[PDB]
Amino acid sequence: MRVLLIHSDYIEYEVKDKALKNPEPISEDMKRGRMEEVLVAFISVEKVDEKNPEEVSLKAIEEISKVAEQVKAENVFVYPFAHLSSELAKPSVAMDILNRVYQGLKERGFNVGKAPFGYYKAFKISCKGHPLAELSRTIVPEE
Amino acid sequence: MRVLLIHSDYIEYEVKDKALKNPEPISEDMKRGRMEEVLVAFISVEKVDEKNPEEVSLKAIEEISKVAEQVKAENVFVYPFAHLSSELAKPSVAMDILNRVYQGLKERGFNVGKAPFGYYKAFKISCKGHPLAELSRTIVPEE
Structure with missing residues (x-):
């Protein structure tokens, strides 16, 4: 797994055309959203993560949470993003x-938003300038 | 080299704290900028590119140009971005x-903007939703 963490003033998206044949089923409220003062987590799930989906997830939960705590963010947004990796x-x-x-x-107490997986999406974001406002992390299962 | 191409309604940035000890020397006009209807090229220069800086560059020039032509973009923005790779x-x-x-x-005739290398930067962007508005490419020298 490869994750890009961006502390943002806001994130906003709108679902467009399907990018996959069998995308993520979505409700009407799911095709658009916005959050402010939010840690946006652009996530690229890799092939190696298939070895242990749970382990990788718990580890990602921990890393994202740890950064949210550092930048004092109460909001987190999960943004499916495949460009951080080729695998x-x-x-x-x-x-x-x-x-x-x-x-x-959400079980950790954060207010969490997300965008649907499998669709092209118009989106807007504003990254704060701070040193910890734009970080990337690599999370993999111990093989 | 790893490149993320985003056809955007606009891109805007403001230089903040230095992220490197010896960042890129910049003028006053360089610490902030904006472009509209622009192909933003987030670029991560990799270790392997050191084998042939020129070859990698020409190839990147070609790929970026080819996509700008596809989305009919007259503006291109070069955005130093290291999170697309770890190498x-x-x-x-x-x-x-x-x-x-x-x-x-610029020698190809595009209007091209860029952000300084080596500094943390607040930035805003709006990705159109179109299928070709968010692409990634891997460019490497033939070793």
Whole structure:
């Protein structure tokens, strides 16, 4: 797993055309959203993560949480993003891990938002300038 | 080299604290900028690119140009971005290749902007939703 963490003034998106044949089923409220003063977590699920979806997820939960605490962010947004890696995971496994992370973050007490997996999306973001406002992390299972 | 191409309604940035001891020397006009209807090229210069800075640059020039033509973009923005890879190039080589690409793009007739290398930057962007508005490419020298 490769994650890009951006402390942002805001994030906003709108679902467009499907990017996959079997994308993530979404409700009407899911095709658009916005959060402010939020840690946006752009996530790229990799092939190696298929070795242990749960381990990778718990580790990602921990890392993202740790950074949210550092920048004092109460909001987190899970943004499916495949461009952080070329060694991508099977779509079904990517969705499962993205859900595990999303769910784990809410169980930790954060207000968490997310964008659907499998669709092209227009989106806007504003990255603060601070040293810790734009970080990347590599999380993998101990093989 | 790893590149993330985003067709955007606009890009805007403001230089903040130095992220390196010897960042890129910048003028007053260089610490902030904005472009609209622009292909933003987030670029991560890798260690392997040190084998042939020129070859990698020409290839990147070609790929970026080819996508700008596809989305019918007249503006291109070179955005130093190290999070697309973990195998990063020496800062001096990264700067040289980022300059070669920037210069090559202008020689092709595009209006090209860029952000300084080596500083933390607040930035805002709006990615269109179109299928070709968010692409990534891996460019490496034939070893």
